[PDB]
């Protein structure tokens, strides 16, 4: 049992590590194009 606020509203560095362990990460173009 882990209620919703505890289970998702934990501090960002712990959630950062937990999801780093699970894979966190007219038109216009660059100056090269004509």
């Amino acid at each position: 049992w882990t209620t919703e606020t505890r289970s998702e509203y934990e501090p960002p560095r712990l959630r950062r590590d937990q999801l780093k362990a699970a894979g966190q990460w007219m038109a216009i173009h660059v100056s090269r194009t004509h």
């Binding site: 049992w1 882990t2 209620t3 919703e4 606020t5």
Partner: protein, 426 residues
């Protein structure tokens, strides 16, 4: 927090009462010797809703036991999880009140009622945070009907602002031991309409039929019939014990469900219901518990809801879940059964989440619901009442202790009122 006072009355009421204290003790992780087990914060931060702490740290019950026999008092005392109950709250009365509303309400039960209001008093004024009462009793007998509704009445003029919540056991017509159910129950409904605001109808017909069909049971003992009741009892008060996303309450249930104040009679469901054969084999998700909560048999009362119309319902959910799936499940079940809901109450579905699942499960739901099919049983036991009252069936046991025949016709007229009010709102 919010104290809830449990009182169980009668041979029937003490048996569900003991089974309810198996279930909530399993939910809160408490040993039968009283001490707490485990490291489970979410089951201990709200321990005061049903428990009290007591000198050595034993989580003593807030439970009051009354029955005018030395009968199931010592069977639940010697049984498992029976050493919890206080050896002061046991009020016996050693003469018997066998199958008589007189020996529970007017005579005999009136002398021991002066001591059980004492036990209600000193337990409740210790902390002045009472959310409600929780009364369990059968109306088809003696002590449970008579002294059960006698405590029902006198508790209401002393706390005339708080819930009392009866998990009543109605006659259950077919399987009916003894012969005075139509007299006892009909002469007890007319108090469960006046000084009551939350009544939970439970029959042994649909309790047996849940056993024979959704569990397929061959020898359904009285232990696991009460296990179905105690699961639904623990699910209707899950939010007073566990945190949640959409927090419900007994008063949130009372304000939202009942119309005009005499319409407080509710079917009850608890439907992750399978056998042990097909126990691994079920996709346990929100769209299919809604299919199981909304098909006849799963309701614990023997009044078929498809012959009537749910005026207001509630879908108090328990578990890990995502909320737009309960919201669209309430809307589409209202859409396909549009004839089964009321045209002058839009959105006839309460919803809530208690977050923490029941023990063993991963999701569940308690479906308490007002139905205008509930007069099906009221006319059934009033028909049995008038069939006996015309010929003056066994009545000298009743009036010999002192009651008037005029009181009985007041009971039948007040109960035939309840048949008419449901009909004109149907």
């Amino acid at each position: 927090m919010r104290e809830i006072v449990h009182v169980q009355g009668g041979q029937c009421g003490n048996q569900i009462g003991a089974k309810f204290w198996e279930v909530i003790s399993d939910e809160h992780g408490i040993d039968p010797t009283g001490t707490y087990c485990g490291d489970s914060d979410l089951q201990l931060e709200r321990i005061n809703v049903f428990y009290n702490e007591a000198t050595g740290g034993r989580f003593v019950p807030r439970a009051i036991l009354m029955d005018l026999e030395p009968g199931t008092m010592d069977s639940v005392r010697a049984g498992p999880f029976g050493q919890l109950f206080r050896p002061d709250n046991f009020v016996f009365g050693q003469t018997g009140a066998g199958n008589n509303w007189a020996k529970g309400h007017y005579t005999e039960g009136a002398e021991l009622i002066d001591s059980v209001l004492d036990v209600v008093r000193k337990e409740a004024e210790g902390c002045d945070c009472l959310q409600g009462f929780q009364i369990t009793h059968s109306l088809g007998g003696g002590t449970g009907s008579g002294m059960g509704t006698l405590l029902i009445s006198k508790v209401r003029e002393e706390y005339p602002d708080r819930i009392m919540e009866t998990f009543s056991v109605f006659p259950s017509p077919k399987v009916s031991d003894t012969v005075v159910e139509p007299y006892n129950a009909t002469l007890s409904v007319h108090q469960l309409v006046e000084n009551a605001d939350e009544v939970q109808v439970i029959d042994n017909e649909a309790l047996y039929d849940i056993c024979f069909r959704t569990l397929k049971l061959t020898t359904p003992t009285y232990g696991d019939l009460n296990h179905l009741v105690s699961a639904a009892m623990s699910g209707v008060t899950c939010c007073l014990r566990f945190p949640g996303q959409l927090n419900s309450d007994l008063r949130k249930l009372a304000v939202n469900l009942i119309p005009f104040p005499r319409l407080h009679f509710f079917l009850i469901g608890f439907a992750p219901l399978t056998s042990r054969g097909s126990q691994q084999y079920r996709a346990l998700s929100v769209p299919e518990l809604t299919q199981q909560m909304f098909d006849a048999k799963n309701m614990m009362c023997a009044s078929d809801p498809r012959h009537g119309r749910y005026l207001t319902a509630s879908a108090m959910f328990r578990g890990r879940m995502s909320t737009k799936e309960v919201d669209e499940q309430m809307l589409n079940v209202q859409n396909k059964n549009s004839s089964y809901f009321v045209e002058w109450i839009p959105n006839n579905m309460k919803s809530s989440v208690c977050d923490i699942p029941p023990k063993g499960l991963k999701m569940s739901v308690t479906f308490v619901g007002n139905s205008t099919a509930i007069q099906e049983m009221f006319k059934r036991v009033s028909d049995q009442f008038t069939a006996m009252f015309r010929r003056k069936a066994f009545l000298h046991w009743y009036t010999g202790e002192g009651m008037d025949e005029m009181e009985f016709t007041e009971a039948e007229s007040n109960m035939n009122d309840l048949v008419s009010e449901y009909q004109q709102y149907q």
